[PDB]
């Protein structure tokens, strides 16, 4: 038999060669590979394939996957394929064709009695986003990020305190323990960042042994070269990531002194885009070093007409600079220039910037990491056109590069890439299912460790789940023991050795961080560029290979007003 390709796309989603436009953007992904056999696809509902003896096998529970996402359009840093996903014991068991091996030709995902089916026909399944710059100001962020498609959050804070309002530092073993205990109530994987602005190594060692997976160096606590050196030495000893938010006052020296203090050791630098500060625009040059992992907060992504006008009050509130105090406005001269903001988007496009963090509720929006990343991708597609290394009339390479900015690169940076980060065998089943019309804006489902954590539910009293009002609600994947079993808490190796998990009675599963101290710029996926970038502090003319870098501000953006009520 044979059917029209349009009918096949309607029934099972796009196959090889079909192009899907992401939500109201100019990015057209193309299905590179199909891992199924035509005419043997598994589909659920009524008299369809997935039934007893037809699509569901006779194997026992240990021989079949616990969950199967059917006919998914997997978009990931390793490719854009069409396949089914089999999840077993809360982890991704296999990627390929699902069904009953008894009567189907090539089945690698055996569907049995113990299998629950999630229909992903005509839907895009991506890995859960990872947010590595999160201010733990309120627990309501955890839900919000989860609605946005972010499943792992790495950051510090103790609540709406003065320190948390400015820095992502959970200071002290007591507050680290309290935040670790509170993390059990949030339906997201959580990693804690300590306070690294200390010249005494013993305090940093105590913080790391308390359970933080990384040390944060921030200007507000003092980003002096001595503190940077001490934190880097402690991290080298204890194998944790170091995040640097270098001082914008030039108090202890210029950016050259900070780079010398780093001394070629791996460090994850925020605000590398030079969106205001004493080190701007020279800090952008830091993206050319192999040991520097450059991130970028979302508020300056992408370049828009309204970007500059909102920066001053945001900075003043974030850094506790009261406009009512005359001496405070002396710090309002943030040295923010539109040239660096325009260059940041192009640097993201070229792969010079490897990460897209949030800096949530402190110069950054927690729920707009994926959204603003795809807005930047759309803007770069509109302005610079197709990339040099694109095959065919599709944006597959650019989509892979940008989806790696918030899925796998943050995972590699903080040493959690062995558990989460991408859709691979053995990874935690942190999946986000989008409808293509709502990709990057509003997911159709967020699967957290094999269970649906949050989903758009309609009226509870309705005879079906669809009727209005439809809004996002936490499902059984975010309830007590079920939430504890379907989430991860990341700890340092010393914390796992010290038995912190049982001392605090952490109900959630424990994952140990490893590999932070060896990741380089080359290890970043699709963002390993180390350009010969030059910038003039007088003209702010950012150049790579002698060519100007510029971007025009966006007047209208996709995924902004078509989807959100307010």
């Amino acid at each position: 038999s044979n059917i029209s390709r349009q009918a096949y796309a309607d029934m099972f989603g796009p196959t090889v060669g079909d192009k899907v436009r992401l939500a109201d953007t100019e990015l057209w992904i193309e299905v590179e590979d199909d891992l199924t056999t035509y005419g043997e696809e598994v589909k659920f509902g009524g008299g369809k394939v997935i039934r007893d003896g037809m699509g569901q096998g006779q194997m026992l529970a240990a021989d079949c996957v616990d969950l199967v996402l059917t006919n998914a359009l997997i978009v990931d840093h390793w490719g854009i394929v069409k396949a089914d996903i089999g999840v077993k014991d809360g982890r991704i068991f296999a990627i390929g064709k699902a069904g009953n091996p008894d009567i189907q030709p090539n089945v690698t995902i055996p569907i049995g009695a113990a299998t629950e089916v999630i229909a992903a026909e005509g839907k895009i399944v991506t890995a859960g986003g990872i947010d590595t710059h999160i201010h733990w100001i309120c627990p309501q962020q955890a839900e919000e990020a989860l609605v946005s498609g972010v499943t792992t959050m790495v950051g510090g804070g103790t609540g709406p305190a003065a320190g948390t309002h400015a820095t992502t530092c959970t200071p002290g073993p007591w507050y680290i323990s309290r935040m670790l205990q509170a993390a059990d109530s949030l339906p997201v994987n959580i990693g804690l960042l300590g306070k690294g602005n200390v010249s005494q190594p013993d305090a940093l060692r105590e913080q790391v042994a308390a359970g933080v997976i990384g040390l944060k160096i921030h200007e507000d606590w003092g980003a002096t070269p001595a503190a940077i050196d001490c934190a880097l030495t402690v991290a080298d000893e204890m194998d944790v990531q170091v995040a640097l938010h270098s001082d914008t006052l030039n108090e202890s020296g210029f950016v050259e002194d900070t780079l010398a203090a780093i001394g070629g050791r791996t460090i994850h630098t925020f605000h590398t885009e030079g969106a205001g500060g004493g080190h701007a625009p020279d800090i952008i040059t830091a993206c050319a070093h192999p040991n520097i992992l450059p991130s970028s907060t979302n508020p300056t992504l992408p370049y828009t007409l309204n970007t500059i006008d909102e920066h001053l009050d945001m900075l003043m509130v974030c850094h506790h600079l009261d406009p009512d105090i005359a001496e405070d406005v002396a710090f309002a001269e943030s040295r923010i220039r539109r040239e660096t903001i325009a260059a940041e988007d192009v640097l993201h496009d070229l792969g010079a910037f490897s990460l897209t963090s949030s800096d949530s509720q402190a110069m950054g929006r927690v729920g707009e990491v994926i959204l603003r990343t795809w807005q930047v991708a759309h803007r770069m597609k509109v302005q610079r056109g197709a990339l040099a290394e694109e095959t065919g009339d599709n944006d597959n390479f650019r989509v892979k590069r940008y989806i790696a900015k918030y899925t796998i690169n943050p995972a590699l940076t903080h040493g959690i890439a062995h558990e989460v980060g991408s859709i691979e065998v053995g990874k935690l089943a942190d999946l986000v299912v989008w409808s293509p019309a709502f990709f990057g804006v509003k997911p159709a489902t967020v699967i957290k460790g094999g269970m649906i954590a949050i989903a758009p539910m309609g009226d509870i009293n309705a005879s079906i789940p669809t009727p209005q009002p439809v809004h996002y609600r936490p499902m059984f994947g975010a309830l007590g023991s079920a939430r504890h079993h379907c989430r991860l808490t990341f700890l340092s190796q010393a914390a796992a050795a010290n038995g912190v998990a049982e001392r605090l009675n952490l109900r959630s599963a424990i994952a140990v961080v490893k590999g932070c101290r060896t990741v380089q710029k080359a290890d970043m996926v699709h963002n390993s560029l180390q350009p010969n970038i030059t910038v003039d502090a007088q003209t702010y003319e950012v150049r790579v290979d002698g060519e100007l870098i510029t971007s025009e501000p966006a007047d209208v953006l996709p995924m902004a007003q078509r989807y959100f009520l307010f």
Binding site: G276, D324, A326, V329
Partner: protein, 264 residues
């Protein structure tokens, strides 16, 4: 092209004190909130979130004082003019005073790096009964390190109008190459005070003594204008502060207490 920045301020009397009625801005020019260290004087700080002014940037500040309003306008830091790539920076300040309005335009010094192609135009429109007390200070180069503004173009134009009549037009134009007007003095300072008398002129001349013979104060059509060239950055600012402190009680009837943004 160029990064256009425009700020328009309208002040008026309300509740016995001067209030910022309107602050309409586009681009990188912002005014957050007036301060009231004194009883009714409106202390205002114009913020320039970009530190310096690169070539091609066009700043346009405009101020309008309603009758009976007293305000003190300051910047929380010097205005840096970076070396230009070929495009000139246009700074245009236009200030209008209604009758009985008092204005203290006290900006920080403008530091011109070598090769900075810039053009400044500050004009004051006053009535007969308006009161003005302002200065304009320029630092040509970086004297402490040795840079002496070898190249670049500068055009500092300052005008005063009283009841639609040009009372003072001070022009300082520097061409690319050596500078003869400054005469090895990279600090060019000007002081303006519209209601003035001969006693104020004598007091100012007394205050200009530590600055030497390069400081000259002249009173024409009641307007006192002080022009000086210096090369120390410590005598210059001290003399400007002393003259302002001497003129403040005689003009606004207020204490000479410094604005808090100057860090004492």
């Amino acid at each position: 092209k160029g990064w256009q920045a425009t700020l328009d301020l309208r002040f008026h009397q309300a509740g016995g004190k001067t209030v910022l009625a309107s602050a309409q801005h586009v681009g990188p020019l912002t005014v957050q909130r007036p301060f009231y260290p004194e009883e009714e004087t409106c202390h205002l700080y114009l913020l320039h979130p970009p530190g310096g002014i690169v070539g091609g940037d066009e700043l346009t500040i405009s101020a309008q004082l309603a009758p009976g309003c007293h305000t003190l306008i300051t910047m929380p830091g010097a205005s840096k003019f970076y070396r230009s790539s070929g495009a000139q920076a246009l700074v245009r300040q236009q200030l209008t005073l209604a009758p009985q309005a008092t204005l203290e335009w006290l900006p920080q010094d403008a530091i011109f790096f070598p090769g900075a192609n810039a053009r400044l135009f500050t004009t004051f429109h006053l009535c007969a009964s308006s009161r003005l007390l302002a200065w304009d200070l320029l630092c040509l180069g970086r004297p402490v390190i040795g840079e002496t503004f070898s190249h670049g173009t500068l055009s500092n134009r300052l005008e005063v109008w009283v009841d639609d009549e040009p009372l003072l037009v001070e022009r300082l134009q520097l061409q690319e190459g050596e500078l003869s007007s400054v005469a090895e003095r990279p600090w060019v300072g000007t002081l303006l005070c519209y209601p003035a008398t001969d006693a104020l002129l004598d007091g100012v001349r007394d205050a200009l003594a530590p600055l030497g013979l390069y400081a000259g104060a002249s009173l024409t059509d009641r307007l006192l204008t002080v022009r000086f060239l210096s090369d120390d950055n410590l005598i210059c600012q001290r003399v400007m502060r002393d003259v302002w402190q001497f003129l403040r009680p005689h003009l606004t009837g207020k204490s000479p207490v410094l604005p808090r943004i100057w860090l004492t």
